[PDB]
């Protein structure tokens, strides 16, 4: 898997507003006024889950539980539905949003498609549902699709065409100048284009848009 | 379930080389000169079993009985023991090989783990056993593991790690540019990558390797 950058590793530590637990999942617990909406996050395929610690920490600082949930060890753990065990572990959460980066987002869309009512929203980072996972008529769902306009792996053209698989009320959020790789803190990535905004700016906009989605659900 | 593509329906129509019976299983009976070895096949999770009919037919065309045995309609019931009932139905087959795609492959390993001497071989398509289903020192088994190098769900890194759970003599067969979905004729697969080879070339390579394995046991 693509390896976490130093700044990822620092994020795994507990600042004053956010506690972190590294176990079967990576858990980011708002220590202060915890909201009642949680975010289950699926990593990119072959990105080390730790690479997204800075994004998850920043989301939690705004009061939302974030559970980064690694790919299953075994194939019986379709339940892609590694989300259900997460939901068992935090019974106090009243509303679940799922999402992911890249292939992870596809997998999140898949869970949402196949388990009606187990989530209230889906957040994509540089991702889109498969043909078979259309959420086009799933009007119960709050859907956000955040994309980098310079992403070389999931181009804006492909993101935009995924409108026909998402509810009419889906919110598409352009990060102008952003790329595929800056949705986490790992390498550059083959296939991808150079960003014209720093990781810092790209993170911020990724965080603000995700938080908006979680707040809309909350 | 992910539905079979139109081609896959052509493969269910019996001729005078291969008779096909669709009942509780999909049975592909070679009528030419039948070999003494049978293949029991477990479908991938959520895939219509008929989606494998092209591969099963191509294998039966080379002499070997194939029986696709569906998992029960509900994802919540297991039954990896399914193969038992197939064996009861074909008393004249002398050697059994079990295999499957993805979750089907894992379930096949479970059956082989728990029914010692009921099969002499296991063939994985994009699959590997669970830890608790190790076939590590099962030198009685001919094991083939056929995998796509671009597979997004069961990645090459993951398949290679399953060496520890398989006999030393296991044969790993890489399908270069193959993905997860092209092990059958169904949609694109949620969570997968695009292949760089046609479904035909992937199918040809999956048939040849599986046939090679049945011939070995035979």
Automatic annotation (TrEMBL), chains A, B:
<dbReference type="InterPro" id="IPR029058">
    <property type="entry name" value="AB_hydrolase_fold"/>
</dbReference>
<dbReference type="InterPro" id="IPR029059">
    <property type="entry name" value="AB_hydrolase_5"/>
</dbReference>
<feature type="domain" description="Alpha/beta hydrolase fold-5">
    <location>
        <begin position="39"/>
        <end position="203"/>
    </location>
</feature>
<dbReference type="Pfam" id="PF12695">
    <property type="entry name" value="Abhydrolase_5"/>
</dbReference>
<dbReference type="GO" id="GO:0016787">
    <property type="term" value="F:hydrolase activity"/>
</dbReference>
<protein>
    <recommendedName>
        <fullName>Alpha/beta hydrolase fold-5 domain-containing protein</fullName>
    </recommendedName>
</protein>
């Amino acid at each position: 898997m693509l390896q976490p950058m130093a700044q990822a590793l620092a994020s795994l530590q507990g600042d004053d507003r956010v506690g972190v637990i590294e176990g079967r999942w990576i858990v980011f617990q708002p220590l202060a006024a915890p909201r009642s909406t949680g975010f289950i996050f699926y990593p990119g395929g072959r990105v080390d889950p730790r690479a997204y610690a800075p994004q998850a920490r920043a989301i939690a600082e705004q009061g939302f539980l974030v559970v980064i949930t690694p790919m299953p060890l075994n194939l019986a753990v379709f339940d892609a539905d590694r989300a259900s065990e997460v939901m068992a572990a935090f019974p106090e959460i009243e509303h679940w949003v799922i999402g992911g980066h890249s292939l992870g987002g596809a997998m999140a869309a898949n869970f949402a498609h196949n388990h009606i009512g187990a989530v209230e929203g889906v957040v994509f980072w540089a991702a889109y549902p498969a043909q078979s996972d259309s959420l086009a008529d799933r009007d119960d769902l709050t859907v956000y699709s955040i994309y980098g306009t310079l992403d070389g792996l999931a181009t804006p053209d492909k993101i935009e065409a995924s409108r026909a698989l998402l509810p009419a009320t889906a919110r598409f959020i352009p990060i102008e100048g952003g790329n595929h790789a800056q949705f986490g803190w790992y390498g550059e990535q083959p296939g991808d284009n150079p960003a014209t905004i720093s990781r810092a700016q790209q993170q911020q906009m990724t965080v603000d848009a995700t938080v908006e989605a979680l707040a809309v659900v909350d």
